Design an enzyme around this catalytic site. Structure first.
Site: not given
Ligand SMILES: C[C@@H](O)[C@H](NC(=O)c1ccc(C#Cc2ccc(CN3CCOCC3)cc2)cc1)C(=O)NO
Ligand SMILES: [Zn+2]
Length: 298
Positions: A79, A238, A265
């Site tokens: 990012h 995104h 990625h």
């Molecule tokens: C896919 C691509 O977009 C990539 N992203 C990722 O792979 C990626 C992004 C975010 C996350 C996360 C998270 C997360 C959010 C909130 C909570 C707390 N909450 C508590 C109550 O219940 C609901 C959960 C815990 C964990 C995991 C993985 C990226 O952008 N890569 O560059």
């Molecule tokens: Zn990303």
């Protein structure tokens, strides 16, 4: 002469890493022409440097993570990299005192803001662009990604999630890239995770810094974030942000067209290396007439 760009001032932000959950301070420093993009772990003695080079990217689909022969890491650079690519930064030292770039709000916008606060300095050396002369395509199962010739930087990204929360008509985005269009259309798009995947990764000690404040969270049936999305098609935007940041691991702005379907990625990095490895498919170019330069950075 179209000149190389760096920062005028040193700027600093603190946050937490998405996967490590570790508190980390990011410091970005100006650097001289022909320095390039350098990332540094400053908590280690001696400190450890990484270059923006496709070959320093760890073998994983999770994020774009820099790693060296000793397995020292700087995780989740995609990012911040997208913001650097978007403002055309050529030379910069990026320092972190922990093994991950802070996630901030999950988008590139906080980094855009910091870079703008730091100011842009144009240096007395020509900015080199990586220009595509042929078409290069890579695949992974149903996933594919391609770079081809084009006088500018055009991106076309398609996703295909089959998820009730992501409408079928919001799964493609096309962009004529400029600093203006990146900042306005792409930079604010946040990362996202599906609960199934979040649970899987949590189970493995990842996502430690994940929160509603830094990510769109999608359960089986819907986005759980109270106030919804920043854009109706925030997800595909995104994915485009990620591709911009991933491609910038070569440390140059590209002149060509990037077209992709479900590329993440690993495949973005595979494409970058496939391009670099075919000498006949690309060249470095510089410019003199500002009025007709292919890419506009402000
Ligand atoms: C896919 C691509 O977009 C990539 N992203 C990722 O792979 C990626 C992004 C975010 C996350 C996360 C998270 C997360 C959010 C909130 C909570 C707390 N909450 C508590 C109550 O219940 C609901 C959960 C815990 C964990 C995991 C993985 C990226 O952008 N890569 O560059
Ligand atoms: Zn990303």
């Amino acid at each position: 002469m179209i000149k190389q760009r760096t920062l005028k001032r040193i700027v600093q932000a603190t946050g937490v890493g998405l996967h490590t959950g570790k508190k980390v301070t990011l410091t970005m420093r100006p650097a001289p022409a022909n320095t390039g993009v350098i990332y540094r772990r400053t908590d280690l003695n001696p400190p450890v440097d990484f270059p923006a080079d496709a070959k320093s990217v760890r073998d994983t689909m999770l994020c774009t993570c820099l790693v060296n022969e000793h397995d020292v890491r700087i995780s989740t650079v995609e990012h911040l990299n997208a913001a650097l690519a978007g403002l055309g930064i050529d030379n910069i030292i990026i320092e972190v005192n922990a093994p991950e770039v802070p996630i901030m709000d999950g988008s590139a916008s906080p980094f855009v803001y910091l870079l703008l606060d730091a100011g842009i300095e144009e240096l007395n050396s020509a900015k080199k662009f990586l220009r595509l002369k042929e078409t290069v395509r890579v695949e992974d199962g149903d996933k594919w990604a391609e770079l081809s010739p084009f006088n500018g930087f055009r991106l076309d990204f398609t996703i295909d999630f089959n998820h009730p929360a992501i409408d079928s008509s919001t799964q493609r985005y096309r962009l004529d890239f400029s600093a203006d269009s990146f900042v306005r259309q792409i930079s604010r798009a946040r990362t996202f995770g599906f609960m199934r995947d979040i649970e899987y990764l949590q189970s493995r000690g990842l996502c430690l810094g994940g929160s509603f404040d830094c990510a769109i969270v999608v359960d089986d049936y819907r986005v759980l974030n109270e106030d919804g999305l920043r854009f109706e098609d925030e997800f595909v935007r995104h994915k485009m942000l990620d591709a911009i940041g991933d491609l910038f691991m070569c440390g140059h702005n590209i002149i060509g067209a990037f077209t992709a379907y479900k590329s993440g990625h690993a495949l973005n990095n595979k494409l970058l290396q496939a391009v670099l490895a075919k000498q006949e498919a690309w060249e470095f170019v510089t410019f003199q007439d500002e009025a007709e330069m292919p890419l506009a950075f402000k």
